Amino acid sequence: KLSLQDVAELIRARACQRVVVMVGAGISTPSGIPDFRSQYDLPYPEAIFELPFFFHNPKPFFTLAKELYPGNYKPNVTHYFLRLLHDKGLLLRLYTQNIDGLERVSGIPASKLVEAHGTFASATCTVCQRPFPGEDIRADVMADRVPRCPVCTGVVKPDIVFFGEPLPQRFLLHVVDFPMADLLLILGTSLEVEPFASLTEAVRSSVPRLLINRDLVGPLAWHPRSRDVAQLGDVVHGVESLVELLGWTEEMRDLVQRETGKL
């Protein structure tokens, strides 16, 4: 049975050198973004990403769109731990279900990212499926107008994966990434949503999987593997503990201050 210190030692020995990371809304609330367990007028949290409610009333979803359209929110320490993981040549890939875009803003290259639940850089008509590039609807959204298709009149929607829609093709990189991974990090996600959650199962059986979350629930709780490790608590604090045990608190402070100075 492994410790969180044990894990950091693996990294410092470089015994773990192709690290893949699944993250969720956990890691972005320290920045101001809502996680949908909670102000927004929905009959229940999930309707913001459901197609029937979206057609009935797209207004809450476009409220959240307007909040997230960039430059409002900054990345916090969890993002920069991922960016530094990259900078140190350790990040094989970072799989996210967030649509706040701060993984990019922290300086992680699109190359190293899989925005598994979509992006705002593109939109699709809800009825005729004509694609449009992002900015072409952005202004509409920033002025509380609902954008419609100039072909069929359909509401056109940002390319956010709702419940019932397929995941983006870039997600299929997991078929290549997970069997190469020597360490899985799960950061700030209750893993409530498939097929994303199922990825925890797709690393090799000797691969350590470290959860830094509030709760230990779902797949990792049910069918756990010997070299699993859970740092339960507030995600930021857990990360900062890992960082100190790594040696990186100092250059972490430097990186955060440098970047937050840039922005």
Binding site: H117, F163, H174, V193, E194, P195, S198, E201, P219
Partner: peptide
């Protein structure tokens, strides 16, 4: 790793 559309995990 599973396939399919985005959906709720079965408890």
């Amino acid at each position: 790793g599973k396939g399919g559309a985005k959906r709720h995990r079965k408890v």
